Structures are given as structure tokens and as C-alpha cells.
């Protein structure tokens, strides 16, 4: 189980930058962001080869412990056994997720969060650096 962090106090428009090492055998990794582990405005799950997906990013929310509806993205600029950085911002309508190679996507802010206080990583992604601006 990966890094867990709380009291992040990330505000709208502020950039959370996460750089890590994608494992060479990577099947999947997760970045979870929200208020706490039961209230996620972003479950960010790149799947290299996992649960029937190949090279697909699956996103979801979690509200009071209840998962929302999964959203599958159109791009996948990740490779196993490489360094990757992700950059996340939000406003009360959307999260914006910036990816390697100039790709980005928006995911609705379904919880209407005004602060992100919680982050957790899991799976085949070793975090090397977290920055808050």
C-alpha cells in the first residue's frame, strides 16, 4: 500500500503535482483524492492490463463510502517501468488532470468539494515527489 496523506488543504486552482515511478511489471495504479478515504472526488486508475481493461484510465468518485459511476478516458500516456508526473487542480465544477505528453482531461466534481485534504496511492506507482504549487 502506497503513500497516504491528509490535511493537504489544497484549494481551488492550486496545483497538486505527483511524480513517481511506474513499475516495470505495471498492471495498474491508483491515485485517490478527496476529503478522506470514504469521500473521493477523484479515484484515478490507469489500467495497463487489469480487470479486463488494456491501456485505459478509469475514473470514479466515492460519496459516503458509495462508489459512483466509472468514467473511462480516451488517452493513456503511460508506459511501464518509467517515470510519470500527474498534475491535478479543481474548481467546484471539475477536476482537471494533466498527464505526460501534454494530455489532459476533466472529470466532474461530483462531491462539490471546496478543498482536497486527502490523497492516497496504490498499485504499481512509487511516489518520489509531491508538490503543492
Ligand X SMILES: OC[C@H]1O[C@H](O[C@H]2O[C@H](CO)[C@@H](O)[C@H](O)[C@H]2O)[C@H](O)[C@@H](O)[C@@H]1O
List the binding residues for a beta-D-galactoside. Answer: 43-47, 51, 60, 67-70
Question: Residues with Cβ < 8 Å from 52, sequence gap 6 or more?
Answer: none
Q: Is 72 in the site for ligand X (CB under 6 A)?
A: no
Q: Which residues are annotated as a binding site?
A: 43-47, 51, 60, 67-70
DSSP single-letter state for residue 101:
G
Q: Which of 1, 54, 66, 74 binds a copy of itself (CB under 8 A)?
A: 1
Rounded to whole angstroms, how far apart are CA atoms 74 and 104? Answer: 10
Grid cell locating 19: 511524480
Which residues on neighbouring strands pair with residue 97, listed in sequence order?
Answer: 88, 105
Cβ atoms < 10 Å from Cβ of 122: 16
From the list a copy of itself, ligand X, none, partner contacted by residue 23 (C-beta under 5 to 8 A by kind): none
Q: How many CA atoms are closer than 13 Å to the CA of 13, on its beta-carbon side?
A: 0
Binding mask 27-46 for ligand X (x = CB under 6 A): ----------------x-x-
Q: Is 55 in the site for ligand X (CB under 6 A)?
A: no
Q: Please say which residue, 8 or 23, places its beta carbon nearer to a copy of itself.
A: 8
Q: Is 67 in the site for ligand X (CB under 6 A)?
A: yes
Amino acid at each position: 500500500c502506497g503513500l497516504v496523506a491528509s490535511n493537504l488543504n489544497l484549494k481551488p486552482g492550486e496545483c497538486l503535482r505527483v511524480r513517481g515511478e511506474v513499475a516495470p511489471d505495471a498492471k495498474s495504479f491508483v491515485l485517490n483524492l478527496g476529503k478522506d478515504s470514504n469521500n473521493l472526488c477523484l479515484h484515478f486508475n490507469p489500467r495497463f492490463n487489469a480487470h479486463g481493461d488494456a491501456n485505459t484510465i478509469v475514473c470514479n468518485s466515492k460519496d459516503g463510502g458509495a462508489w459512483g459511476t466509472e468514467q473511462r478516458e480516451a488517452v493513456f500516456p503511460f508506459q511501464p517501468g518509467s517515470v510519470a508526473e500527474v498534475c491535478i487542480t479543481f474548481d467546484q465544477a471539475n477536476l482537471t488532470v494533466k498527464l505526460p505528453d501534454g494530455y489532459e482531461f476533466k472529470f466532474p466534481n461530483r462531491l462539490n468539494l471546496e478543498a482536497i485534504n486527502y490523497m492516497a496511492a496504490d498499485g504499481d506507482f512509487k511516489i518520489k515527489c509531491v508538490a503543492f504549487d
